Design a protein around this ligand. Sequence first.
Ligand SMILES: O=[N+]([O-])/C=C1\NCCN1Cc1ccc(Cl)nc1
Ligand SMILES: O=[N+]([O-])/C=C1\NCCN1Cc1ccc(Cl)nc1
Ligand SMILES: O=[N+]([O-])/C=C1\NCCN1Cc1ccc(Cl)nc1
Ligand SMILES: O=[N+]([O-])/C=C1\NCCN1Cc1ccc(Cl)nc1
Ligand SMILES: O=[N+]([O-])/C=C1\NCCN1Cc1ccc(Cl)nc1
Lengths: 208, 208, 208, 208, 208
Amino acid sequence: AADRADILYNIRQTSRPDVIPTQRDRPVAVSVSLKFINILEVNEITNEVDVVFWQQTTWSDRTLAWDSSHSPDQVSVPISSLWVPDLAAYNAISKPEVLTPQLARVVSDGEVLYMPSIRQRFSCDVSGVDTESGATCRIKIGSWTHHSREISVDPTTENSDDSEYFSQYSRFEILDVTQKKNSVTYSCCPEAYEDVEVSLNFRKKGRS
Amino acid sequence: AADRADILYNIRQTSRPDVIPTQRDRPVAVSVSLKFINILEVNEITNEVDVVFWQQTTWSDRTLAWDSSHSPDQVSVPISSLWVPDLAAYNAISKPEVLTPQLARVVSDGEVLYMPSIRQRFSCDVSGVDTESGATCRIKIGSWTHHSREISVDPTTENSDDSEYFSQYSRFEILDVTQKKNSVTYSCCPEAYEDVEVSLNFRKKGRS
Amino acid sequence: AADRADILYNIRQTSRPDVIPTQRDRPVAVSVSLKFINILEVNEITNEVDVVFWQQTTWSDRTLAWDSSHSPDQVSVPISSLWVPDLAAYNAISKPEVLTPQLARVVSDGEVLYMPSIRQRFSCDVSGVDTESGATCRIKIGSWTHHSREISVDPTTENSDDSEYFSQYSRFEILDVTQKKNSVTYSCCPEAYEDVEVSLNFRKKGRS
Amino acid sequence: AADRADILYNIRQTSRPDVIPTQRDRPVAVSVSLKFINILEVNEITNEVDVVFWQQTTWSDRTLAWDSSHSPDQVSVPISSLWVPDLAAYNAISKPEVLTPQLARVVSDGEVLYMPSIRQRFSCDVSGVDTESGATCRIKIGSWTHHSREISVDPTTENSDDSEYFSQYSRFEILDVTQKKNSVTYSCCPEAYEDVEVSLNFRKKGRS
Amino acid sequence: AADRADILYNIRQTSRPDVIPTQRDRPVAVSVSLKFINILEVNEITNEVDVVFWQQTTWSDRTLAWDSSHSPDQVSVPISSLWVPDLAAYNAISKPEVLTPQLARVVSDGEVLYMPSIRQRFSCDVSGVDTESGATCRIKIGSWTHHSREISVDPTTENSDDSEYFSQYSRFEILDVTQKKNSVTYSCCPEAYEDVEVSLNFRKKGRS
Ligand SMILES: O=[N+]([O-])/C=C1\NCCN1Cc1ccc(Cl)nc1
Ligand SMILES: O=[N+]([O-])/C=C1\NCCN1Cc1ccc(Cl)nc1
Ligand SMILES: O=[N+]([O-])/C=C1\NCCN1Cc1ccc(Cl)nc1
Ligand SMILES: O=[N+]([O-])/C=C1\NCCN1Cc1ccc(Cl)nc1
Ligand SMILES: O=[N+]([O-])/C=C1\NCCN1Cc1ccc(Cl)nc1
């Protein structure tokens, strides 16, 4: 009869925060979805935008699974005690500013969810933000050091209201957000690196 | 009997900072209460405010309980030695800047009080701030990863002077502050997350 | 004899940085005095000031005492190795920017001295800063979690020249500084908290 | 027949982060290559630029080698666990801001690859940035404390688009980039510190 | 013979980062020399300047000495493994932004050198910066907690051009640098603290 103190204790034993949990010989499947919450400073001259969003991130780590028959099925764990994808926004020009406690949710079957609220500035296409069609800023997120055979990233395919959580007090409004996937092979290495491109179509409110 | 050294030593032995102190199978009852100290910046156009407040937070942790029979009934302890509610302001657009020493007060009975002074920026309704009826900025604070069955949040209905500790030198003045309990559900999970909605009715000071 | 290394080793053995060193069952007498070095960014419209000052702090911790008959009677020690009063400036709107090496000076009898040069911004009365009588900004500094029975704060009775170390290059000049003691009771607790009130009377320099 | 866990373990076990991994008695051969991603802010009056670039850095540490016949021959490793070249931009006027996860890639032969995306400000010739011939900002990168006998610096001679990864939304465009091997010496001593001079020839984009 | 790893281990096993390396009861003789690299933000209205310099620091700890007849004569060591002078710029109004890897150089005879490149804002006489005679900004640096009998600082009146490494791209030029020494007693203690005062004579570069 283990409690929550036991679950965390035995997770610290099996978990290796620096060892990607590749099962057999397959890549770790990381799903990523960006819940846009706000759009702050926007500079059409420099093509920069300050965005706030909840980066819903999920994956499975079997080395964490336990028996939930006489124990809770889920627990909150500091991410510093788990392995986490080394995701990076390729066109970000400031490091990600995490606004929420850095805790992930771990399910007895090894499923992991981490959804930090992040504030980050980006280099993207802002032109057209003050027009009916709006501007389309594309955000590219993917593993920085794990190629396609170690980590694959796919947008959590779930038809959701693009502005379900978007602040109603923002000067901007979201016209549409589309998430796509891509595989790129750089110089350094022969293997491909997967990324997800989130396109944020938005414009200023109250235009003539 | 014992001294402050023993109390902290003991807290050190039984305290589990990363384990939510749920006694039995019910949620930890956390009380939240904001005391507004200042309103530094307000933007009528972007609907943004920069404020300073004391986030009075209390909860119970049985494991820390000790007999004050012949020793102090209270000690100041670094929050890094205790478990703390993973509270977050859902509409905040900046990381919380804790202006005070990160020490919590622990009562011999396991009661915990943590009151950090915090400066933080929020996205909220600033319209009407320049009028007699002022503006109403609602700030939502609740656990980030613990749903209703693990954490409950309720305000401290201590009907006091909303501007009791408010700075007299601020450019704004407080008209009224009300704290309402609120529940919310999201995608990830079926169970809802509780939060305390703080309505700050304030306006600019002056004639006209 | 004994060397500075021995002194530091033993200090580290007896020092309980997280335990207030109360003698008998009395409060630790903490002396606080400010030496103003500069006045940087004044704003009479927002009633905010950016100030640089030396926070001369002294207290006693007998549990760090040693025999200096054949050894040195003083050593510099990192503050992390010592218990330090959890002092806070009640009307500060930015956390303190400690500009100096965080080392405290310890005497063999247990007297501790810690004097960091601090740059911090405050919310205070800036009205009249550009008039002959200048403005009077009052700074309140005291323990954040230790009430009167645990910590007592008193302004060092000394009387250095108010602007003896104040930069001659500031746009402003000090007209007078008075540091008075004070006590305050809150909503959380029946026992009061002590604080020193420092009144900085200053003005922008004239011309001719 | 060892998995990634054993590999990383071994690496954390034999790696000496503070000891230069000198093979026999020849300097450590470090290769440095900059891949400009953006030119954020430019000032022709103060000869100062703000640029983002991927700093491709490679070297060898034979002690980390492991038999990958029946095991992975490449793992991601926290640079904190490894010895890393103490490279510095000699004409940088700001601390390098690493925007990406600080992980290096280690091959089973001891080859170490580290490519952090960095944002940093430099003091360099910006004159002509607004002409068809644009400006030429030269950035010097080399070891800060290891002269030529301890560390050698060489540009990863690899033909490729000078702006293959440069932002298309930037306000500037890259005309050419030449990375030349070179060295620096100081009065005091005969010691010679090798570096890589990266010539960034760019100009303001024409709105046409 | 001994390799670099053996040299480090010996250093780590005898150097005491928190213990000043005093000889008998003689004060540690520290050498300070500033090599200006740039003069960035300059404000004659507020008398503030942003300066980038190499803070060449020298001292010795003979207990770290080894035989280099058949072993390296020098090694780079993280300053966190060494005792380092607690130097502070008295008229600095910003904490130092260390731009270079924080590694020192220890020589086999016990000498230790540390040359961090630093950017710091100073409060000093900026008046006359736009004239032929320019301005004279005096920078004062010395130990913060070690008086004259524990540490003595001396300006290396070595032969070297003032703007030998000074940037050509700065909006200013150096006219003459002179280093003097001083000793001061403060309202806290009886013993005096030494310091080196650097007078930087610079002016706005003009086509005259
Ligand atoms: O949108 N969601 O699915 C969920 C949430 N949005 C804001 C807080 N929230 C709850 C939550 C659940 C799991 C984790 Cl790891 N972090 C936060
Ligand atoms: O408002 N209050 O109830 C109490 C306080 N306000 C400012 C300092 N203060 C004292 C205090 C007590 C306990 C804790 Cl945990 N922190 C601060
Ligand atoms: O540009 N490149 O050559 C390579 C890359 N650019 C972005 C991610 N990427 C992959 C990568 C591989 C190993 C390391 Cl150490 N860092 C990054
Ligand atoms: O001026 N010098 O003699 C030497 C140097 N100036 C800038 C870097 N540099 C090399 C150097 C030497 C010793 C140390 Cl400890 N750090 C850097
Ligand atoms: O003003 N004073 O009394 C003393 C000082 N002012 C600047 C440096 N200084 C010396 C000093 C002594 C002890 C400690 Cl703990 N810190 C600084």
